[PDB]
Design a protein around this motif. Structure first.
Motif, PDB file in Angstrom:
ATOM      1  N   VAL A   1       0.944  -1.012   0.040  1.00  0.00           N
ATOM      2  CA  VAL A   1      -0.065   0.060   0.000  1.00  0.00           C
ATOM      3  C   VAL A   1       1.169   1.207   0.008  1.00  0.00           C
ATOM      4  O   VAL A   1       1.849   1.418   0.883  1.00  0.00           O
ATOM      5  N   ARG A   2       0.824   1.993  -0.959  1.00  0.00           N
ATOM      6  CA  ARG A   2       1.347   3.463  -1.025  1.00  0.00           C
ATOM      7  C   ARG A   2       0.966   4.211  -0.033  1.00  0.00           C
ATOM      8  O   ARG A   2      -0.145   4.399   0.107  1.00  0.00           O
ATOM      9  N   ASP A   3       1.644   5.134   0.309  1.00  0.00           N
ATOM     10  CA  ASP A   3       1.301   5.898   1.593  1.00  0.00           C
ATOM     11  C   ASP A   3       1.767   7.514   0.934  1.00  0.00           C
ATOM     12  O   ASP A   3       2.843   7.706   1.289  1.00  0.00           O
ATOM     13  N   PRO A   4       0.822   7.973   0.274  1.00  0.00           N
ATOM     14  CA  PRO A   4       1.080   9.426  -0.397  1.00  0.00           C
ATOM     15  C   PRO A   4       1.360  10.544   0.583  1.00  0.00           C
ATOM     16  O   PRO A   4       2.317  11.379   0.265  1.00  0.00           O
ATOM     17  N   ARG A   5       0.708  10.371   1.693  1.00  0.00           N
ATOM     18  CA  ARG A   5       0.926  11.489   2.746  1.00  0.00           C
ATOM     19  C   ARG A   5       2.183  11.316   3.322  1.00  0.00           C
ATOM     20  O   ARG A   5       2.764  12.349   3.692  1.00  0.00           O
ATOM     21  N   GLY A   6       2.810  10.116   3.802  1.00  0.00           N
ATOM     22  CA  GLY A   6       4.247   9.848   4.204  1.00  0.00           C
ATOM     23  C   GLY A   6       5.212  10.226   2.920  1.00  0.00           C
ATOM     24  O   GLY A   6       6.038  10.935   3.640  1.00  0.00           O
ATOM     25  N   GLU A   7       4.756   9.955   1.818  1.00  0.00           N
ATOM     26  CA  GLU A   7       5.768  10.612   0.840  1.00  0.00           C
ATOM     27  C   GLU A   7       6.026  12.045   0.610  1.00  0.00           C
ATOM     28  O   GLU A   7       7.004  12.602   0.470  1.00  0.00           O
ATOM     29  N   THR A   8       4.862  12.744   0.999  1.00  0.00           N
ATOM     30  CA  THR A   8       4.698  14.193   0.826  1.00  0.00           C
ATOM     31  C   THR A   8       5.417  14.651   2.101  1.00  0.00           C
ATOM     32  O   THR A   8       6.518  15.530   1.862  1.00  0.00           O
ATOM     33  N   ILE A   9       5.257  14.152   3.321  1.00  0.00           N
ATOM     34  CA  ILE A   9       6.003  14.500   4.566  1.00  0.00           C
ATOM     35  C   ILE A   9       7.592  14.405   4.111  1.00  0.00           C
ATOM     36  O   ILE A   9       8.654  15.094   4.439  1.00  0.00           O
TER      37      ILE A   9
ATOM     38  N   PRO B   1      18.794  13.567   5.128  1.00  0.00           N
ATOM     39  CA  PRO B   1      18.628  12.176   4.314  1.00  0.00           C
ATOM     40  C   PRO B   1      17.769  11.143   5.007  1.00  0.00           C
ATOM     41  O   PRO B   1      18.140  10.079   5.554  1.00  0.00           O
ATOM     42  N   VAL B   2      16.159  11.590   4.879  1.00  0.00           N
ATOM     43  CA  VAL B   2      15.380  10.309   5.369  1.00  0.00           C
ATOM     44  C   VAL B   2      14.716   9.582   4.257  1.00  0.00           C
ATOM     45  O   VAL B   2      14.481  10.386   3.089  1.00  0.00           O
ATOM     46  N   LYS B   3      14.218   8.310   4.306  1.00  0.00           N
ATOM     47  CA  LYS B   3      13.687   7.486   3.341  1.00  0.00           C
ATOM     48  C   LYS B   3      12.829   6.522   3.718  1.00  0.00           C
ATOM     49  O   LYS B   3      12.483   6.509   4.944  1.00  0.00           O
ATOM     50  N   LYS B   4      11.763   6.192   2.908  1.00  0.00           N
ATOM     51  CA  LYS B   4      10.705   4.981   3.350  1.00  0.00           C
ATOM     52  C   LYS B   4      10.012   5.695   4.437  1.00  0.00           C
ATOM     53  O   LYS B   4       9.640   4.899   5.413  1.00  0.00           O
ATOM     54  N   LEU B   5       9.663   7.065   4.500  1.00  0.00           N
ATOM     55  CA  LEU B   5       8.732   7.404   5.496  1.00  0.00           C
ATOM     56  C   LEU B   5       7.452   7.113   5.288  1.00  0.00           C
ATOM     57  O   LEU B   5       6.647   7.233   4.600  1.00  0.00           O
TER      58      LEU B   5
END
Lengths: 84, 87, 84, 86
Positions: free
Chosen positions: A18-26, A37-41
């Motif tokens: 499941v993609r998490d677009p809110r997480g991606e925006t953050i 340098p943060v990833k996979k939030l």
């Protein structure tokens, strides 16, 4: 009967498919705007609760039932539980 | 740089409203569990659980970055408090 | 700087070579009156507290200071710490 | 019959319920914050009872601990408790 207390925190997350677009925006904000340098939030839910029960195993059954009956969507979410 | 390995460190951040902040969403959930589901839960609080990974030379620097993320964006310091753990 | 929170429970007990007459009295009541097969009862202190700190090592340092400066009498007590 | 009965060690952590005011705890928190300069919050002072219980198995031992709490160690109106193995 006065029963012992068991405290928990439930970590509910969207499953990996499941993609998490809110997480991606953050994440984009942190990386592009804050230079971090943060990833996979992933943005999920932390439910803290406690229960009085006859023993630890019964307490966990109550926790699992709350997840199964309300807190976690089994198709899109998974959960972990920790003791507090 | 020079094909050097750069490690990744995974964390969870548990962001919760401070105790003097009301949580009506949690109250609703608690009431469903108790009164509709018959589960004797209590003191239910609904916060946020942010999972993330940090690329850094070492875990200590990665932990500093996590705290910077919370300060700069992830946590509202007025109404929230937070706990970080390694995943 | 908004620092992370660290939650702890401190268990303060008399050292094994300090007598605990309060413990002994409680044990007597539980065995002789209540009929419960309990032994070696020790009455100590439980202190739950939360600390803000820069990392987990500094937080433990704050807990140790609280023990050494107030909560634990080193002559007659010892403590264990657990995370909540 | 000289039958071995195991001992099981437990700790009981007894605390006042959250709706109960704890002047002693409040005092200690003030001293740690204001007199010792420590960044401490939400301090709660309760009892830590360590005990051993002689029983056939751990489950029976745990039942005895709870009975000890009900019968004496925990005030049902103003206290709550957690039990752990030691």
């Amino acid at each position: 009967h006065h029963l012992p207390l068991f405290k928990f925190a439930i970590d509910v997350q969207y499953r990996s498919n499941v993609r998490d677009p809110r997480g991606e925006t953050i994440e984009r904000v942190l990386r592009e705007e804050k230079g971090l340098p943060v990833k996979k939030l992933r943005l999920g839910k932390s439910i803290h609760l406690e229960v009085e029960a006859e023993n630890k195993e019964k307490a966990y059954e109550i926790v699992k039932k709350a997840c199964e009956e309300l807190l976690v969507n089994p198709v899109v979410e998974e959960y972990e539980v920790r003791e507090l």
